[PDB]
Structure 1
Amino acid sequence: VTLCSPTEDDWPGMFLLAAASFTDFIGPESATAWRTLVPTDGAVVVRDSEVVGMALYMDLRLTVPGEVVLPTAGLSFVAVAPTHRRRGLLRAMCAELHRRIADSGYPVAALHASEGGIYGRFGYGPATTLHELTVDRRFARFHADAPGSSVRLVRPTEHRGEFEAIYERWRQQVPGGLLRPQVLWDELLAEAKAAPGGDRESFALLHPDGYALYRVDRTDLKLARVSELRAVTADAHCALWRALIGLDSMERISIITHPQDPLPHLLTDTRLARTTWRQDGLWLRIMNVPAALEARGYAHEVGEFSTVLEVSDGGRFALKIGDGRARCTPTDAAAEIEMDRDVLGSLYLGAHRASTLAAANRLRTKDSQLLRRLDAAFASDVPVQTAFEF
């Protein structure tokens, strides 16, 4: 077995392994669109002859707290043949790509995890939380205090520009926001079309400062699934939910959102917005600890403090945080905080509290005051969301 950058002659074998490995395989045509986001030397294959291993990264732009956009290496299309399990092919491919990603100058790498138990050992920590809400809309009444017709029912393919403009503003402002390039808008509006023996037609609700794409479930005809809701203002978010609660032929609206979604609070009965499902969203590997920690903004509310952070096999740093900025410098001084790289990725967008990871002993300190200060500093003012799966 040998690991190397694939040739144009290797892609047919990679599409075969993809088809066999991913039930949601977008297909060779759709796969060729995403491929435009893979840089030269962004892919590795293992050959036995035939492709038994593959992995690649895409050039992404990720918004982190303080509205800072980081170049981000998005790992995807990671697959080992069922014939070559337990031969260390994933370890070899991840090591080679991480070397390339580091050398290329990416401060962070990211992925969506097929299973929860794989990526921790390679330094990835779950950094966003997906939260399905199901609304029994038959009972939903808006609170007297709820804002709000500004919303239009439209065909998605006829309003691409308005969606792109809204999404662009949304992402420049929401931790977890990813730049969505033209090819991914092409793929999005193609999935909006009804499929024979497949998904039903998608509709859009369009506000000047928000949109929702939804479709009726293929099997449950009383369930509407919101595939995407992007609102830049509270007014837009409320107006869009008023329109969705107005789908009078539906019993239930389901959406995959984030834990801080205000929808429950718009209703007289908060319990009507049931949390039916929760899962890790985006995973982060901090490739360069000082660059990552210096790049993001921190809470202005916490006062200036200094400490020494050790990342296991990742460096030891003098960390000074004040005025919502951090300085992270090399030091041999005694560490006051110790954690694995994955734990740092989990703190980085503010989705997990340092005191919660401390309680599990994923994060060790002898100063409870230092823990409270970390919790407060790494908190995100704007709640962290999940842009789109890759």
Structure 2
Amino acid sequence: VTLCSPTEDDWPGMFLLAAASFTDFIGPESATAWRTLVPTDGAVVVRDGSEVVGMALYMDLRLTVPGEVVLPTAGLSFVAVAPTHRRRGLLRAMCAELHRRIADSGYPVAALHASEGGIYGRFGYGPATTLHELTVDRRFARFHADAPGGGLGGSSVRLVRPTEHRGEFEAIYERWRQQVPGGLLRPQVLWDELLAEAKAAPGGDRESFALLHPDGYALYRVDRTDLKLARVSELRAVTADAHCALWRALIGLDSMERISIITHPQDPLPHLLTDTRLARTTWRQDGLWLRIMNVPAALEARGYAHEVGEFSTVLEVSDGGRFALKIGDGRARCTPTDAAAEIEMDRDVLGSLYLGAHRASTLAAANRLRTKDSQLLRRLDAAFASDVPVQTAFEF
């Protein structure tokens, strides 16, 4: 029972484990395409002895963080342990090896989407974005007098077939992802999957349609069983006008009773309507999880709020070093020190703070970060806050 990088002959066995582990498994053809995102030595397998009983890999990603800074990011995925080999330390062994490789490769951060919420905190990952499902009872929905694009003339939005406007979705998304913390570059094989999923499937999903604006798009489909529910699979808007225009069109889906979308807590949609309550939050969950691999590289790469005045402190990460952290003029400097720590936190907690989705004060109230100075808390809060709201790009 040993651990190594898979050879070509291991992949059929990995796909078997994948099929048995993931109910949404994209299948061997598509998985084989996604292998193009996995660097050489980006994967590990555990063989029994013979067959594969554990696996994990990372993909090369590009993550936007506050200040519109794009970081090379190791995206952990395809993680599975056979049901025959539970409680044998296989996950811990696989994660340790990949983390070794990721750090040595020079990635400042790693990221993943969690199947369950109790697994990845012990390996240094903190939840860093928040998924927020809104369900709109569109039959009652009326736009506020203040809402953009209500006046006379035509609409700027077109109802189109997704496959015929791939180039335009790509361009809009590429713009979106570079300006939003949480944004990920979406490579071509992921655009292949997305448009493949836009098609109707016998006994599966219904056909998807798109609403296209120069500065935004929405992909939606009627739910397979609830025929009065339209599910927006993706809405990417680069301006506020595009966002409002797209929502006017979606609320114009007169066949539907309800429109649902997985969005973020700061989505302005509720405020576009005369009754903000009609945009019901029906589900809330962690999105992207972050493990800061190199504390000073990560903290220095990020932009910080200009509103907070220059301050200096000493931050200890529980097994990640102690640093003199100086933040001013929207930038941080983060250098080694053995001076007494003013702030202490586990590595995962820093991941949760990093994109601005959780407040230091909130984590402090849970005692997940310790400081004896409340002014320092207020300052961290303000400094780490993100000007542009944090969003979740796509699952991987």
TM-score by length of 1: 1.00
1:9 match: secondary structure: helix
CA distance in 2, matches of 1:250, 1:47: 50
Partners of 1:239 and 1:29 in 2: CA distance? 38
Please name the residue that 2:21 is paired with: 21
Distance 1:29 1:87 in 2: 31
CA apart distance, 1:318: 0.1
Q: Which runs of 5+ in 1 are unaligned?
A: none
Q: What SS class does the counterpart of residue 116 from structure 1 fall into?
A: coil
1:313-348 deviations in Å (ceiling 9; x for gaps): 100000000000000000000000000000000000
Q: CA RMSD in A?
A: 0.5
Report the CA distance between 1:159 and its aligned residue: 0.2
Gaps of 5+ in 2: 149-153
Q: Deviations over 1:58-83 (max 9, x none)?
A: 00000000000000000000000000
The runs of 4+ residues in structure 1 deviating greater than 3 Å are none
What is the CA-CA distance between 1:186 and the residue it aligns to?
A: 0.7
Measured in 1, the distance between the counterparts of 2:223 and 2:327 equals 48
Query: In 2, Cα distance between the equivalents of 1:137 and 1:220?
Result: 15
Deviations 1:211-235 (A, max 9, x none): 0000000000000000000000000
SS of equivalent residue, structure 2 residue 249: helix
Aligned-pair distance for 1:285?
Answer: 0.2
CA apart distance, 1:282: 0.1
Once the two structures are TM-superposed, the CA of residue 245 in structure 1 deviates from its matched residue by 0.2
SS in 1 for 2:242: helix
Does residue 1:253 correspond to 2:254, yes or no? no
Deviation at 1:140, TM superposition (A): 0.1
% same residue: 100
Corresponding residue for residue 78 of structure 2? 77
Among 288, 296, 302, which residue is 2:294 paired with?
288
Question: Alpha-carbon deviations, 1:112-151, whole Å to 9, x = none?
Answer: 0000000000000000000000000000000000009000
Task: Tell me how far apart the structure 2 counterparts of residues 324 and 284 of structure 1 sit (CA, whole Å).
Answer: 22
Deviation for aligned residue 1:33:
1.4
Once the 2 structures are TM-superposed, how far is the Cα of residue 172 of structure 1 from its aligned partner?
Answer: 0.4
| Corresponding residue for residue 120 of structure 2 | 119
2-side partners of 1:178 and 1:35: how far apart? 18
Query: What is the TM-score with the length of structure 2 in the denominator?
Result: 0.98
Shift of 1:202: 0.3
Q: Distance in 2 between matches of 1:25 and 1:182?
A: 19
- Give CA-to-partner distance per residue, 1:332-379, whole Å, 9 cap, x none: 000000000000000000000000000000000000000000000000
Q: Deviations over 1:153-190 (max 9, x none)?
A: 00000000000000000000000000001111011000
Question: What is the CA-CA distance between 1:34 and the residue it aligns to?
Answer: 1.1
TM-fit CA distance, 1:93: 0.1
How far apart, in 2, do the equivalents of 1:190 and 1:24 lie?
A: 14
SS in structure 1 at match of 2:319: coil
Report how many residues are paired: 390
Deviation at 1:253, TM superposition (A): 0.1
